[PDB]
Amino acid sequence: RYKPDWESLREHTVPKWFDKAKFGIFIHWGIYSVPGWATPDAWFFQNPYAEWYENSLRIKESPTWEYHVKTYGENFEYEKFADLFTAEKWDPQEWADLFKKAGAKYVIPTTKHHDGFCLWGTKYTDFNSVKRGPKRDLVGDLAKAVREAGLRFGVYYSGGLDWRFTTEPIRYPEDLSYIRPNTYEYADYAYKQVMELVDLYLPDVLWNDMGWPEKGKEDLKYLFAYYYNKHPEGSVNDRWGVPHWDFKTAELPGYKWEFTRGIGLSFGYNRNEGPEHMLSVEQLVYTLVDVVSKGGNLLLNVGPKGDGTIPDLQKERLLGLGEWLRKYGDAIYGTSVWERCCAKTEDGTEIRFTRKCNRIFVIFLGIPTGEKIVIEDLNLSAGTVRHFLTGERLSFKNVGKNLEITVPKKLLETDSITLVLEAV
Amino acid sequence: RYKPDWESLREHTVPKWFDKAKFGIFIHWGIYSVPGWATPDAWFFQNPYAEWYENSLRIKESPTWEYHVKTYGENFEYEKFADLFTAEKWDPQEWADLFKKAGAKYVIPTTKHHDGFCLWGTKYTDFNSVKRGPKRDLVGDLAKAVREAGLRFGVYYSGGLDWRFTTEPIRYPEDLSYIRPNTYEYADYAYKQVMELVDLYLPDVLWNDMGWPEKGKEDLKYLFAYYYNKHPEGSVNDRWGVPHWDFKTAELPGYKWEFTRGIGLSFGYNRNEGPEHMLSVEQLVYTLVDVVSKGGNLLLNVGPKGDGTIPDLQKERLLGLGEWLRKYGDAIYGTSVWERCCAKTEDGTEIRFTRKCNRIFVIFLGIPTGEKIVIEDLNLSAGTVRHFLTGERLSFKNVGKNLEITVPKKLLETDSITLVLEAV
Amino acid sequence: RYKPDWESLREHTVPKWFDKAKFGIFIHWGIYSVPGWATPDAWFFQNPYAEWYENSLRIKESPTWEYHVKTYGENFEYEKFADLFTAEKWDPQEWADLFKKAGAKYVIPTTKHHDGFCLWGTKYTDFNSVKRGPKRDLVGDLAKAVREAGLRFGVYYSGGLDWRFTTEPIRYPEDLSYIRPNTYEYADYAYKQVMELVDLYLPDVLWNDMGWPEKGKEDLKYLFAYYYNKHPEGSVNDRWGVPHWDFKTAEDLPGYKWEFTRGIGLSFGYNRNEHMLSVEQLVYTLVDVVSKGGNLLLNVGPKGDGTIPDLQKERLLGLGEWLRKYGDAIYGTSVWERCCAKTEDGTEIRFTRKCNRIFVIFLGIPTGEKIVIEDLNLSAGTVRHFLTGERLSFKNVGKNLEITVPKKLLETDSITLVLEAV
Amino acid sequence: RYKPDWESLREHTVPKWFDKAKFGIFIHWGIYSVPGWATPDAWFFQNPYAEWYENSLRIKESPTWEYHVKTYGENFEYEKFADLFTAEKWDPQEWADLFKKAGAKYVIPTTKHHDGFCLWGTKYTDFNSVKRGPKRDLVGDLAKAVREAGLRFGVYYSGGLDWRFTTEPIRYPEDLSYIRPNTYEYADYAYKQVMELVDLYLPDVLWNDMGWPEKGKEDLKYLFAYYYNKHPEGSVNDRWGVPHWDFKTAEDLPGYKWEFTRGIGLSFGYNRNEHMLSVEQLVYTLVDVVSKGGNLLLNVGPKGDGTIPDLQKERLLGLGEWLRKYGDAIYGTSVWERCCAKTEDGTEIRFTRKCNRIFVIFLGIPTGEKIVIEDLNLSAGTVRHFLTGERLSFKNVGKNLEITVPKKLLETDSITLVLEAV
Ligand SMILES: C[C@@H]1O[C@H](O)[C@@H](O)[C@H](O)[C@@H]1O
Ligand SMILES: C[C@@H]1O[C@H](O)[C@@H](O)[C@H](O)[C@@H]1O
Ligand SMILES: C[C@@H]1O[C@H](O)[C@@H](O)[C@H](O)[C@@H]1O
Ligand SMILES: C[C@@H]1O[C@H](O)[C@@H](O)[C@H](O)[C@@H]1O
């Protein structure tokens, strides 16, 4: 049993499933998906993030304001998008199947982003998906489908920012130091809402954002102890601004962390986003391997449309990643870091290392065109280095500081995207 | 005038009436009286307290859950008892007469227990006796009747626990450290509700329970100063978790205290309670004398049914106590502690001492069967020891460390339950 | 057992001995007794308190500065008085006997006043009576003598003010809000010194003054718990500025215990330029205070050589001669239903209770046999003349209570007519 | 780089060496080793811990007081033992070699226990081993010797208790809530002393005790950041009473790292009146603790002259002889899917993992060849006898796992039967 104080909650280390998961799906989906628009220290004036539509719209000068006033009209309040957000062609089982085939082991939707619209039937505001728009508990139905597909389910919550409680926009990063809800009322509201998510859906991950209101930071001792006592395999990110977290986030470490990025640049759906603002399947795999070899997990974001469909370009990149993970999944899932993160060849091709007990997977970022491969600054523990995908044994010798190794061309042609070897 | 700070509020000592009162009636009565059921470190799983019905019901495993799901059905929410709680045959004048005849000098009902149902027309929740169930201000009508009978009126309030603000039950004592309302919203709610009781009924006693929310502990400086300034003869118990109290509670001291217990084991009405889970009239009198000789008051609880009647077994024990207090009341009411609490005879019979200026009442817990009574470790201040109930003088001498004294058998037969003497 | 937190320490009510004590002796005695001088909006510029000599001296051109610069010289540092404080003719048994004969039940000397000179062998400063001046543990020798005489022994300590830690004087009351030691170093120093008094002498009273340093206020839950656990009959005044105290102080009827403090004269420390109360006014004060639930802490300001001025000795013995006669109507009494009353004539009256007995103490001796007391009805008891025990006839008349006490008995009483109803 | 705030310091997880270390030596050694005496609701009145000699001595009439007043005399102050603590026959290389042969990977001496005597040349008190007694920097010479033997070196420090700053003893556990130094002066003193240990010896472990003074708890975000930035492989226990620690202590399977501490005997400091564990019980403790994710910190209580009692030396060497054989199944291991298991016979079993290898350590040596382990199914690997490496036949049978190990191999093992599946 966890007690409600920081010393006691430190006893909760990161759960084993999360360290082994390696890959998860972020989902940025709200009423901001309806307009789904964004421009292709002037960051907030030309916000490339479609989720920040309302903030950009509150800046009268901006291109989001130009677009909005021409597409929808000057007197079209942002709140009106809630009724346009009908998710009429949303099938959560189809999402869960997509994410499972993509190779993800956990899924995290935005229960409530900065605009403050909640994607569940919360009883603390009427600005949610049950009373407005979809007339449907989006979080709960996604949680059911995700878990029926055999995946873990987390929740993103914008604890630090809620624009239902402000009127002024963020124009500069320094504005965030005072343009917050700021009231005791909000501190209670955020506490009750995350407590409600825990009670209703018992998430495997509590992914807070933008810090936690200062007035309720000491509430989290009670929230975290409550959560862990109901769900010891539950986890908590590092965006609460308090002494406790299970893993860190980012946009060889001894702690666990998680790199988050979108398939594109924007997190929410953006129409203005060209097909060359997005990563290729190759770049997604390279990111996954790089991150995972450094002890991290990848949280890859998906920005679905307001009608509940995932853009074909995004579906494509997910399935292509999962086709790669279906072949090379044994060298990623359930792996630890090796003695070192990275390495390169004499040629130039970068290399990453993942361990799985006595095995050491050697993952080349790319497929070398030559049979004779020379890896710099490595002298392997004289064992048995073998081709991974076919299993076939391979000859190799040590040379001063580098490591020479021949791999026939007949085997290179089998590998897709990355050549991977495996020592013992 | 009291200032709102702890140093200043210390000037308020316990009121004279309360120290002299000696005996009071607790009343545990709510919507939990309707089901009125309880099982005959596993305490919370088999709670013998019927007031904790809802907590026990939230534990799916428990016998309260078995009973509830069979008597009322799985989908019978606990809140539904509010509408079953009609107090149709409740007459408060009949209660006040009962408590007055029982010998009580003050009466304290549960305005709001842990379940959060209020027995008055509070304007801070619709979960009360005016909007639901009785359609009647139960606290106010009891206050009128109690005061018309010439008794003081206090209020119990569950400041520390309110299950209207939680969903999870208490399974272990350590759960109480974090399964509390916890919000600023609740701290205000509790403050406004006790302030409302003060404004509406001006209670002679403020009997808080389960501590006060940490977020509003400093509010009580303002509450206590406000209260004492309107009502200097008002009093305050020791369950707020702050530096100030007028008397302590429990379940020779220099401070004033108050032992609270039920006629039975449960505080709320329990049907499952046999007639041999309750104290006899003899044991109630023995408790009263023991407590009062140690500087304390007795707060004897009554658990009425949901229809507003007090079980005949409880009525019986109260009237029998009051018949005893009608005879021996002069040795209890308005007494102080003597040089020592207790004493025993050579035979074995225990003895308690109460003072009233130059008088010293000697109350035997039981009626010795022999005329020759030898009291251990006592040498009285050579005065005049007399039989109390008849007044008749009695012979006595000192003997080493003990004190011999003859009391004719004709006088023993007059005394009911306790022989009592009286020195000068 | 007492825990170190305010909620737990509230369980310590005022000890029974202190409530019954009624009368105690304050002693303001230090190196300020050596010059022992004070002048006969601008209170601090013309301080009538001789203990504040150093503060007044730091105010250049003030009358204490004029006197000092002429009697001792401009370059005569105040600290130099420590070596002049010899306590030549000091006899603690003589003091303890004087206070016992005066009728006092407890005695409280200044272990350290605002100037910061300590009257004991403290190991936290060398500015004390053992290393300087008397070469003698003044507090400890007085404690031994006072307890041998059968009296309780308390300690005054200036926790809030210490002029060893400041250089600027107090010219106005608002100056006290910032001209304090202010350092963590001082907060520890004060804690360690009161801890040391407790360890060395285990005082029955801890009489702090001028509040406690803000930084050390949380230290006192520990100090008080430590103190009460070693000495449950110990007590603590109300000048720490924290939620806990046993009795209040002061310079219808309260439910708490309090203590009026005042000197025989106006000054607390010895003053030559000294305005003194008569024996009659001291008795009247005692009775007034005691009938209102309070104790009287009467101050004595001895000279630097260790003798108590004859005028002060005289007032104390005269008070004790009165207390020897009428002590049963004061010591061990509680308050009655009301404190005060007057006669049709004008003479004020005070009431003390002692169980079923209720003493009626006249502030003065009425010159007439027929006495009419206003707004008082006594439930037909037996009103006795107190000192002789003789019975007196009384009747109830409307609001008032007519009583007839013979001339023989009025001339018997000294200072106060005292009756005794039941 | 680590910033001085709790959120940043959480990034420091327990160092890999400490998780792999498994076994370490505690050393309770001070001036309390000189008398080295302790008696065979009232724990503090009959303290079995010889390190608490002074506390027990402050309790007048207690058995430590009887012994002390007869062996040394009533006017023999406890502080006088500092001059008796000569460490005559002390040889740090002899100690370091003993601990290395015992199989320990790290060593932690008491730099300062509750009595406040420091075993190094601190410049914040003259009550230490350089100015008194040994005339020698005991901590530094042990640190040099321990690191020369190839072992890690930590430091115990009594941050929460220091009896140089109190006079009253601890009679009950509730006394610890207020009988502490309590001053800002102490909070600085503790900070400066641990800062000084870090600067002088850069310990691999900072083993604080009895919490950290309330006034100095915020100082520790700075001390910890300073420490980790100079020494990232450094570690910190859980007895500071702040949000941060690297491992917990103690006197299904945890996710955090912890450390069981206990003496060879009952007392931590040397006791004559001493109740000791056998070699078998020490090995059983080590295996039990290690299979549950913990380390064992085994205490040694040397005499005042600098020698370790032969009985203690004996137990340590016997443990190291066992660890020399079975060290591969302990050092560098993680926890398995579950900690514990038993046979149909009754013999307890513990599991340690080392990648794909899973060691099966029997607490005792089964007398029969046919061994049936309850509730255990092993995925058909290759179960080897550990010490000889020979292969063993096994079958899965319902819930259990039948295995046949020849008598030849059971008689080979010492204390524990050890197998090795894959
Ligand atoms: C994952 C990203 O985190 C950031 O803090 C947010 O501002 C973005 O909108 C997005 O949710
Ligand atoms: C008098 C008793 O006090 C306790 O704290 C409560 O838990 C019981 O329900 C009851 O009200
Ligand atoms: C009793 C008086 O208390 C005051 O606070 C002090 O300033 C006086 O010097 C005197 O000691
Ligand atoms: C390891 C033990 O820790 C406890 O806190 C101490 O009181 C003992 O003396 C010993 O050092």
Side-chain angles (χ1 to χ4, degrees), chain A residues 379-392:
Chain A
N379 280 318
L380 235 161
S381 316
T384 60
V385 180
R386 6 197 167 210
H387 188 293
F388 165 81
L389 189 60
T390 61
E392 196 135 302

Side-chain angles (χ1 to χ4, degrees), chain B residues 282 285-286 289-290 324 328 331 343-354 361-376 378 385-386 394 403-405 407 412 415-422:
Chain B
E282 179 172 89
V285 166
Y286 286 176
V289 168
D290 177 65
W324 183 85
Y328 300 92
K344 49 159 84 171
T345 59
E346 198 174 11
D347 168 70
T349 301
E350 286 272 295
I351 307 173
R352 297 291 186 276
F353 303 118
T354 58
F361 295 92
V362 182
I363 310 181
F364 288 72
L365 274 32
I367 300 152
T369 65
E371 294 111 60
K372 196 80 68 156
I373 292 163
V374 187
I375 302 159
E376 231 179 55
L378 211 208
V385 180
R386 6 197 167 210
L394 301 164
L403 169 132
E404 323 210 332
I405 172 159
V407 304
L412 297 174
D415 286 295
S416 172
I417 305 169
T418 62
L419 163 65
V420 326
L421 294 171
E422 135 175 348

Side-chain angles (χ1 to χ4, degrees), chain D residues 298-335:
Chain D
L298 191 64
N299 178 77
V300 165
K303 301 178 176 142
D305 70 2
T307 49
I308 294 166
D310 273 58
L311 290 173
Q312 288 177 39
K313 272 192 219 164
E314 188 144 298
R315 263 72 168 167
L316 290 164
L317 293 166
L319 215 174
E321 243 293 278
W322 182 88
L323 271 164
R324 179 175 277 92
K325 294 194 191 70
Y326 298 103
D328 227 72
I330 290 297
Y331 304 136
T333 56
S334 295
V335 300

Side-chain angles (χ1 to χ4, degrees), chain C residues 26 28 49 51-52 113-114 156 209-210 239 251 268:
Chain C
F26 224 156
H28 283 69
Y49 290 11
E51 339 91 63
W52 286 67
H113 209 264
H114 306 335
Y156 170 106
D209 198 18
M210 291 302 308
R239 301 201 178 185
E251 284 188 60
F268 280 95

Side-chain angles (χ1 to χ4, degrees), chain D residues 26 28 32 43-44 47 49-52 110 113-114 156 158 161 163 207-211 239 250-251 261-263 267-269 297 299:
Chain D
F26 224 156
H28 283 69
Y32 48 79
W43 174 270
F44 292 106
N47 218 319
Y49 290 11
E51 339 91 63
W52 286 67
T110 51
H113 209 264
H114 306 335
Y156 170 106
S158 178
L161 241 45
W163 298 331
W207 218 95
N208 189 59
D209 198 18
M210 291 302 308
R239 301 201 178 185
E251 284 188 60
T261 170
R262 82 147 301 163
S267 178
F268 280 95
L297 224 203
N299 178 77

